[PDB]
Design a protein around this ligand. Sequence first.
Ligand SMILES: Cc1cnc(Nc2ccc(C3CCN(C)CC3)c(F)c2)nc1Nc1ccc(Cl)c(NS(=O)(=O)C(C)(C)C)c1
Length: 127
Amino acid sequence: SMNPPPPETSNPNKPKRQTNQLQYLLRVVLKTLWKHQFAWPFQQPVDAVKLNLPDYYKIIKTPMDMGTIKKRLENNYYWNAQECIQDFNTMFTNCYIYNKPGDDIVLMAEALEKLFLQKINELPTEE
Ligand SMILES: Cc1cnc(Nc2ccc(C3CCN(C)CC3)c(F)c2)nc1Nc1ccc(Cl)c(NS(=O)(=O)C(C)(C)C)c1
């Protein structure tokens, strides 16, 4: 059961912007989660072949990970902050959909999500 191609991170025809909110999502939100001790399972797309999870991409149909988010922010791929915030939320929700309460991977996502929520609570107003 192969891995699908990763989510898109480059598209020259996509309208995109650099807003102060998107700068905050890279410089504060992404950077804080990325350096966390629990970040590594989320730093790249799930390799469901190497992890022996043949059902993963049959259940998770909108995959997302912080490696993809990092590339999108570095490429200024987004139009607005909500688009990027949705990518984070997709990543967390996907984790809770696929896994069981109290699993190690869920505990790791919950720690990252708590920090995520604390940082987006202080999202600056758009200038
Ligand atoms: C982002 C994400 C979401 N969902 C899952 N679900 C998952 C569920 C079960 C397993 C094993 C399957 C064979 N079983 C024998 C043990 C468990 C699995 F490999 C992964 N994985 C994720 N990313 C990830 C990336 C690298 C690794 Cl090494 C792991 N492994 S892990 O066990 O979750 C960890 C060591 C606690 C981090 C996960």
